[PDB]
Enzyme design. Structure first.
Site, PDB file in Angstrom:
ATOM      1  N   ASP A  31       3.996   0.248   1.710  1.00  0.00           N
ATOM      2  CA  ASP A  31       3.033   0.655   2.731  1.00  0.00           C
ATOM      3  C   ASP A  31       3.420   0.143   4.115  1.00  0.00           C
ATOM      4  O   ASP A  31       3.413   0.891   5.086  1.00  0.00           O
ATOM      5  CB  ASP A  31       1.628   0.155   2.384  1.00  0.00           C
ATOM      6  CG  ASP A  31       1.108   0.725   1.079  1.00  0.00           C
ATOM      7  OD1 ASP A  31       1.530   1.834   0.700  1.00  0.00           O
ATOM      8  OD2 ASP A  31       0.273   0.056   0.437  1.00  0.00           O
ATOM      9  N   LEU A  83       4.538   2.036   7.506  1.00  0.00           N
ATOM     10  CA  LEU A  83       4.000   1.363   8.702  1.00  0.00           C
ATOM     11  C   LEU A  83       2.472   1.404   8.736  1.00  0.00           C
ATOM     12  O   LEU A  83       1.886   2.369   9.215  1.00  0.00           O
ATOM     13  CB  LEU A  83       4.562   1.976   9.995  1.00  0.00           C
ATOM     14  CG  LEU A  83       6.074   2.213  10.074  1.00  0.00           C
ATOM     15  CD1 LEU A  83       6.477   2.690  11.471  1.00  0.00           C
ATOM     16  CD2 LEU A  83       6.874   0.979   9.653  1.00  0.00           C
ATOM     17  N   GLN A 131       0.174   2.071  12.070  1.00  0.00           N
ATOM     18  CA  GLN A 131       0.001   3.388  12.688  1.00  0.00           C
ATOM     19  C   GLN A 131      -1.156   4.198  12.074  1.00  0.00           C
ATOM     20  O   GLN A 131      -1.718   5.066  12.736  1.00  0.00           O
ATOM     21  CB  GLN A 131       1.309   4.196  12.631  1.00  0.00           C
ATOM     22  CG  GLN A 131       1.637   4.883  11.322  1.00  0.00           C
ATOM     23  CD  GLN A 131       2.842   5.818  11.447  1.00  0.00           C
ATOM     24  OE1 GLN A 131       2.878   6.687  12.319  1.00  0.00           O
ATOM     25  NE2 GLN A 131       3.839   5.629  10.581  1.00  0.00           N
ATOM     26  N   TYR A 168      -5.204   5.664  -0.985  1.00  0.00           N
ATOM     27  CA  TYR A 168      -5.901   4.447  -0.989  1.00  0.00           C
ATOM     28  C   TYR A 168      -6.035   3.831   0.441  1.00  0.00           C
ATOM     29  O   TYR A 168      -5.333   4.278   1.410  1.00  0.00           O
ATOM     30  CB  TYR A 168      -5.358   3.480  -2.043  1.00  0.00           C
ATOM     31  CG  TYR A 168      -3.825   3.358  -2.016  1.00  0.00           C
ATOM     32  CD1 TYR A 168      -3.242   2.437  -1.074  1.00  0.00           C
ATOM     33  CD2 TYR A 168      -2.999   4.119  -2.900  1.00  0.00           C
ATOM     34  CE1 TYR A 168      -1.817   2.281  -1.001  1.00  0.00           C
ATOM     35  CE2 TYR A 168      -1.582   3.973  -2.833  1.00  0.00           C
ATOM     36  CZ  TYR A 168      -0.984   3.034  -1.869  1.00  0.00           C
ATOM     37  OH  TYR A 168       0.403   2.876  -1.789  1.00  0.00           O
ATOM     38  N   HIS A 177      -0.742  -3.918  -6.342  1.00  0.00           N
ATOM     39  CA  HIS A 177      -0.684  -3.984  -4.879  1.00  0.00           C
ATOM     40  C   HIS A 177      -0.246  -5.390  -4.532  1.00  0.00           C
ATOM     41  O   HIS A 177      -1.009  -6.315  -4.740  1.00  0.00           O
ATOM     42  CB  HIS A 177      -2.031  -3.695  -4.213  1.00  0.00           C
ATOM     43  CG  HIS A 177      -2.666  -2.409  -4.639  1.00  0.00           C
ATOM     44  ND1 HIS A 177      -2.552  -1.246  -3.907  1.00  0.00           N
ATOM     45  CD2 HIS A 177      -3.440  -2.105  -5.708  1.00  0.00           C
ATOM     46  CE1 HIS A 177      -3.212  -0.278  -4.517  1.00  0.00           C
ATOM     47  NE2 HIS A 177      -3.762  -0.773  -5.608  1.00  0.00           N
TER      48      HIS A 177
HETATM   49 CU   LIG Z   1      -4.938   0.020  -7.190  1.00  0.00          CU
END
Ligand SMILES: [Cu+2]
Ligand SMILES: O=CCc1ccccc1
Ligand SMILES: O=CCc1ccccc1
Ligand SMILES: [Cu+2]
Lengths: 620, 620
Positions: free
Chosen positions: B290, B295, B298, B374, B425
């Site tokens: 990500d 980026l 932005q 997400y 994540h």
């Molecule tokens: Cu997740």
């Protein structure tokens, strides 16, 4: 009409009267514990049978008694004489605290120890501490407190700043005898004061803090009925209060559509222990069972509006018994309020052009207690999304010692000459589960790593595994943070729309558990604290992980004895006991008064709902 | 006046002009990244030079460039042609998100795949996903995106409810050709909609929530000067914003009486990766960087009052460059406010009779971003008591797939036929440390259990140990929750009044780290994510744990390369890189839109102060 209503002053007065009428509460008797009993398992119920359990102490030396009375029917249900040398002493009486300093003040051994240190006995405070069980054979069957001394320079001085190391005394609080005075040598009594309201220490007070105003113009979103029944944002529960456990939650349920769905039948902190890790003879015996020995509910603070609880607060004022059976109110002892809790859900979608944001909030039920030097806040949270959380806030003043000249491996330095013995604060949450009803089971869930190879040629796959705990003998579990270990409580007979058993997932903080050597007195007395998770089959008389009588009681009761029954817990009425705690190496910043540190756990729905349960939350 | 001020629109305009004039911004050039460079280490008064770093892409196929310009002097400091097969491709252009769907729509293989599934090509959204590096030799040096299909039934439909499984395409976004279309077979496209604003799905909205009003009648307690310099409750810092990293904190310091004491020189989230753990060839390549590839700055959202940020909010509106060098403002992209944080400290003392309670407060600096399906909230917190904290809040919609008949070890079922591939994540916090200045060191601190024996006769002792990390080769560290492992950053040349080096202690959540097989591509490109804590010697050009050009880099860039220099870190200018993340096994409750879940870390003072730093907080 609710059987889970709080005890009233009238009920406690009536218990006193029933005990008096039965010849069980004469002038030599003292109530060391009194609490209302939960209704028995049975939906074909009474109109009401309110029953109270009482521990009755005798100040003349006679055996104490455990008594259950029915206030409804005005009868003694049962009364048994206790053999305390076997099954444990009663909780410490608030009146026996005084006895130690007073008795010591006329003891020649104690006076000689103080004179050796040039200390005025009038200025020496004695901390009245639970004695535990060690090698002193004469203590068996006797009510003993051990005393540690602190100098108070003037009536509003913080005596914790001035520990008197190298000295401890043991006292029989019933016979009024000083049994032992041990002096291992003089330590400098630290001179610096720790008075955190003194301008010379605080400096000028900040003028920079602007007010933060939290109000509810239309009042709170929760309702309170029948004294202690709460309804809030689809949640339903009863808030009880017991003098031992403090705040207890009953009948936690969630209204999902038309159905009121049970989640937890009873939630409480069933024990908490504070073991000290300084091997000095002056303190190596030191272990506080705040709940089991002292009764944390009894010392619940009166919480002031604006100060302790900010916002639109609804208070409960629970009633307890004093030592003679008279009711005493703890005014504003429980805070209830809801608070904003940031973003609940958010998504900005490129393809649909919809930007969606919803805010979260949580229901808070809390109380705050004081055990000598230190203080704890107990907080229960209910969130919009079905999450249940507990948080303990540890603060107060640290329990002090001298800091040894050449340093220490078991004590930190707070100030010149001033030590803070290493210790832990370890809690046991007793969760009597009812995920969609009483037929529940527990699975241990670990992340599963997978090896690169056939079926996983790029080596990216990972998975998880679940292991049902089927019997009590296999239900004593340890944390494994590295593999993301959690425990799922499900109902194998209740499935979501995807045909999976509905569940709740317990997330632990994975803090260290009890550090003491497995062969120690404290490892036996606080056996629960040595493992993160226990699961038992529900039974009426299995209430505390340490048993009914913790004071000066050896191993032999509590969770290790319950578990031995090896009962079926696979799709049965079960109870989860979660051990969690703080390991405290005190830092300079903890002195002269400690900023709040926290620990806790939470449970999140896991296929309990058929989709997000917060789609009906408005923008506003 | 400050070198740490946010970039202005005019500065960005000036950069555009400089590039254009030098011939570096023709009609086929595209700005893939643009950001202001931090000031170099020290030292000479001022004579300050605003320098901007730029990555320039060429859409006609020429080599891209890395260019540094001086806005202050209107010059080009350097321009280097990049060999992208060697050092990696430039970040994805937002304008390239569009290209994939458009190219595929006239590809015969793609249309055949959609015809077989009876899907109207006009209704098929294609997610533009980073390609990574795998077995496809023809991709080396090429700029590739991979596409996964989602059906949108109507303009406002959530396409994520309708994944098209068994199908994936690869496209060269420069030559504009479809290099591969892979159809592994037909899966039913899940039919249920996931439109969380459809009353049909939400049901009647709740009317039960009463307002919570948060106001500051006299304004906030923090001040903002020079656009982004914040002073609050003894804290001092500058809030920066970078298009890649997002919010960046500079010069975090604490004013302790007479001194302004530095603690952290620069704090940021320097990478974030979302590895997917589904071994299907349709998704087995899928890893979102990500931060590094997309980026996150932005895509930062504009935050609304009452919705995203509640209370008395002070906004920053950071400016970035578009693809052509035009300044674009992100209106209200950064929220700053202070919020109540419960009890700070509390003690009710029996002996002194003094009852003492203080409220806690935290300064909040946040922003929210969106990466396709997400969304993340990034929150930095400063507390009264010296604690520094970060928290990430993950929400949005889950990235979906089919749910295989027969079930899956790597995908969970959200709705009939609808799957959610397991993923993580994982974040990297880059903390350029400055504990009382730049001479710092890191110690690993473990709890130490002790055995019952001589010097520990009751078996109650426990202790701790600290191990200095002295060189980079020994500074790649693992979590150990079981032994309460933390890491202390100290200054060996700055001692407190007890003659101890001042320090800050890093408390990690101890969540699982990267789960992928060690030999996998993702383990090599995201090596940082395989360990919890890294320490490096500070260097100018070591900015990201994944290297400067993450997109389609073959592996080993960033931290593993840095650590390989094996530099002295014992009492030196050092950088802490903490890995922390969520392991997501999506639950039914995560659908159709996900309630926030959280992860983070904090740092607490550790003998940094000479006593509690909050004694001067007033009673409120
Ligand atoms: Cu997740
Ligand atoms: O339990 C700690 C001992 C104590 C008891 C009463 C007042 C202060 C300190
Ligand atoms: O990066 C995730 C794919 C995506 C990109 C843009 C809009 C929707 C979905
Ligand atoms: Cu403590």
């Amino acid at each position: 009409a609710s059987p889970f209503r709080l005890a009233s002053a009238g009920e406690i007065s009536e218990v006193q009267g029933i005990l008096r009428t039965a010849g069980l509460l004469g002038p030599e008797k003292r109530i060391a514990y009194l609490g209302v009993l939960d209704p028995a398992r049975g939906a074909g119920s009474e109109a009401e049978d309110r029953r109270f359990r009482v521990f009755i102490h005798d100040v003349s030396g006679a055996r104490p008694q455990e008594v259950t009375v029915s206030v409804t029917n005005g009868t003694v249900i049962s009364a048994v004489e206790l053999d305390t040398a076997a099954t444990g002493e009663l909780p410490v009486l608030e009146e026996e605290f005084e006895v130690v300093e007073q008795l010591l003040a006329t003891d020649e051994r104690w006076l000689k120890a103080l004179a050796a240190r040039n200390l005025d006995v009038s200025k020496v405070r004695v901390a009245p501490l639970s004695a535990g069980v060690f090698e002193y054979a004469e203590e068996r069957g006797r009510r003993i407190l051990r005393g540690l001394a602190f100098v108070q320079d003037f009536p509003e001085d913080s005596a914790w700043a001035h520990p008197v190391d190298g000295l401890v005394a043991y006292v029989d609080v019933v016979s009024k005898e000083v049994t032992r005075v041990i002096d291992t040598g003089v330590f400098p009594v630290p001179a610096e004061h720790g008075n955190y309201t003194d301008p010379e220490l605080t400096g000028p007070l900040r003028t920079t803090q602007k007010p933060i105003s939290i109000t509810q113009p239309e009042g709170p979103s929760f309702t309170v009925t029948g004294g202690n029944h709460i309804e809030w944002e689809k949640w339903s529960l009863d808030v009880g209060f017991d003098v031992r456990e403090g705040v207890v939650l009953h009948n936690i349920a969630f209204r999902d559509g038309d159905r009121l769905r049970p989640i937890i039948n009873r939630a409480s902190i069933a024990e908490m222990v504070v073991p000290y890790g300084d091997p000095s003879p002056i303190r190596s015996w030191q272990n506080y069972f705040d709940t089991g020995e002292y009764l944390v509910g009894q010392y619940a603070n009166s919480l002031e509006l604006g100060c302790d609880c900010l916002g639109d607060i609804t208070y409960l004022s629970p009633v307890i018994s004093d030592a003679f059976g008279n009711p005493r109110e703890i005014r504003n002892g429980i805070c209830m309020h809801e608070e904003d809790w940031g973003i609940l859900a958010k998504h900005s979608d490129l393809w649909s052009g919809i930007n969606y944001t919803r805010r979260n909030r949580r229901m808070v039920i809390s109380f705050f207690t004081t055990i000598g030097a230190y203080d704890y806040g107990f907080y229960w949270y209910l969130y919009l999304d079905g999450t249940i959380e507990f948080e303990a806030k540890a603060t107060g003043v640290v329990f002090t010692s001298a800091f040894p000249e050449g340093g220490s491996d078991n004590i930190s330095q707070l100030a010149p000459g001033l030590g803070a013995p290493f210790h832990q604060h370890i809690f046991s949450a007793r969760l009597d589960m009812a995920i969609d009803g009483f037929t529940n089971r527990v699975e241990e869930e670990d992340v599963v790593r997978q090896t690169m190879g056939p079926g996983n040629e790029r080596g990216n796959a990972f998975s998880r595994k679940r292991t049902v705990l089927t019997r009590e003998s296999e239900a004593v579990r340890e944390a494994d943070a590295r593999t993301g270990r959690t425990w799922i409580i499900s109902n194998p007979e209740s499935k979501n729309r995807l045909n999976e058993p509905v569940g709740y997932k317990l997330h632990a903080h994975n803090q260290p558990t009890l550090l003491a050597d497995p062969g120690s007195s404290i490892a036996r007395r606080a056996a629960f604290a040595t493992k993160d998770l226990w699961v038992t089959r529900y039974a009426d008389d299995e209430r505390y992980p340490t048993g009914d009588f913790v004071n000066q009681h050896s191993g032999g009761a509590g969770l290790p004895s319950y578990i031995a029954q090896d009962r079926d817990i696979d799709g049965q009425d079960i109870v989860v006991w979660h051990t969690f705690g703080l390991t405290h190496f005190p830092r300079v910043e903890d002195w002269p008064i400690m900023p709040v540190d926290t620990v806790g756990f939470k449970l999140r729905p896991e296929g309990f709902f058929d989709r997000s349960p917060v789609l009906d939350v408005p923008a506003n």
